[PDB]
Amino acid sequence: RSKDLRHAFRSMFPSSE
């Protein structure tokens, strides 16, 4: 899904921290 693409940004949250 294309909505899952937005979930990829969530993986950057813990990586951005």
Q: In angstroms, rounded to a whole number, what is the distance separating the alpha carbons of residues 1 and 17?
A: 27
- The Cα–Cα gap between 5 and 10 comes to 9
Method: NMR
Phi and psi, residue 7, nearest 5°: -75, -20
Label residue 12 exposed, middle or buried (CB < 10 Å: 0-12, 13-18, 19+). exposed
